[PDB]
Amino acid sequence: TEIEHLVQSVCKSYRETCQLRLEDLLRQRSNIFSREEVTGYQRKSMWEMWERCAHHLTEAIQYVVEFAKRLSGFMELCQNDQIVLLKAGAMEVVLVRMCRAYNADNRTVFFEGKYGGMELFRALGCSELISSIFDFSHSLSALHFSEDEIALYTALVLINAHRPGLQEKRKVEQLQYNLELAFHHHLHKTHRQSILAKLPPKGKLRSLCSQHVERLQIFQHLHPIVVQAAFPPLYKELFS
Numbered sequence: 001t002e003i004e005h006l007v008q009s010v011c012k013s014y015r016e017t018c019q020l021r022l023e024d025l026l027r028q029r030s031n032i033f034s035r036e037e038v039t040g041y042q043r044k045s046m047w048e049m050w051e052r053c054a055h056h057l058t059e060a061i062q063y064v065v066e067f068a069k070r071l072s073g074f075m076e077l078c079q080n081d082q083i084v085l086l087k088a089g090a091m092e093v094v095l096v097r098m099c100r101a102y103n104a105d106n107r108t109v110f111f112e113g114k115y116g117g118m119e120l121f122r123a124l125g126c127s128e129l130i131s132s133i134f135d136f137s138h139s140l141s142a143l144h145f146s147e148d149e150i151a152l153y154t155a156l157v158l159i160n161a162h163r164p165g166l167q168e169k170r171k172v173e174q175l176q177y178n179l180e181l182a183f184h185h186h187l188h189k190t191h192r193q194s195i196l197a198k199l200p201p202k203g204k205l206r207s208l209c210s211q212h213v214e215r216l217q218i219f220q221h222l223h224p225i226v227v228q229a230a231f232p233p234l235y236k237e238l239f240s
C-alpha cells in the first residue's frame, strides 16, 4: 500500500502544480490566433519576444520546482542533489508538459491565451530549435498521456540517479526505484503498459533539452531577464 500512497502523492503534487488545467486547454483548442494576430507577433522585436518567452519559461520551470518539492523524499535529499536533479531535469519536464498544451491536428500550441503555430515565434530567429520542440510535442501527442501518466512519468524524469554529480547516489536510487514501481504498477492497473514501448528514447529528451537551454543561456547572456528565484541555489547556478 506504500506504493499506492506514492501513486496518489505524485498525482496530487502534479494536480497542484500542473499550471494549466487540461480541460481549459482542450476546450480552448478552437481559439486560434488570426492571420493578423500572428503577424502582430512576427513583427515584434526579437528582444520583446525574448522577454515574453523567457518569463513564460521561467514561470513554467518554477511550477516544476514546486512539483519536485512535493515529491516524497525529494526534500530529504541533500541540497547539492536537489540542484543536480532539477538543473538537468526541470526543463525536460517543461518540454514534456508542453504536449498537454499542444494540438496535433493543426500543430499549434497554447500561448498567451490562444493557439498558434511555430511561425508565431519567427522574430526569435530560432526556427530549427523551435521546430524540434514542436516535433517532440507532436510525437508525445500520439500517446494521449493521461494526467496521472504524465504525473508519474515527469516524476521519473526528475528522479534519475544517473545524473552526473550526485553526492548521495543511493538515496536517489531508492526514490527512483519506488517511483518506477509506482509508474509500472499504475500502468498495469489501468491496462496502459502499451505506452512503455512508445516513450521517447531518454537520449532524445536530454539532447533536445540541452539545445534548448543552450539557446536560452545565449539570449540570457545578450538580454538578461531577472526573476524572484523560487530555488535560489538552483537559480544562482543558471542566472549567476
Ligand SMILES: O=C(O)c1ccc(-c2nn(C(=O)c3c(Cl)cccc3C(F)(F)F)c3ccccc23)cc1
Pocket: 054, 055, 057, 058, 061, 062, 086, 087, 088, 089, 090, 091, 213, 215, 216, 217, 218, 220, 225, 227, 228, 229, 230, 231, 232, 234, 235, 238, 239
Ligand atoms: O525560480 C527559480 O529558482 C528558477 C527559475 C528558473 C530556472 C531555470 N531557468 N532555466 C533556463 O533555461 C532559463 C529560462 Cl527558463 C529562462 C531564461 C533564462 C534561462 C537560462 F538562463 F537559464 F538559460 C532552466 C533550465 C533548466 C533548469 C532550471 C532552469 C531555475 C530556477
Ligand SMILES: CC(C)CCC[C@](C)(O)[C@H]1CC[C@H]2[C@@H]3CC=C4C[C@@H](O)CC[C@]4(C)[C@H]3CC[C@@]21C
Pocket: 018, 019, 020, 050, 053, 054, 056, 057, 060, 094, 095, 097, 098, 101, 109, 110, 111, 121, 124, 126, 129, 130, 133, 134, 212, 215, 216, 219
Ligand atoms: C527562446 C526560445 C527557445 C523560445 C522557445 C519557443 C517555444 C518553444 O515556442 C516556447 C515559447 C513559450 C513556451 C511555453 C511557455 C509555457 C508553457 C506552459 C507549460 O505548462 C507547458 C509548456 C509551455 C506551453 C511552453 C512550451 C514551449 C513554448 C511555447
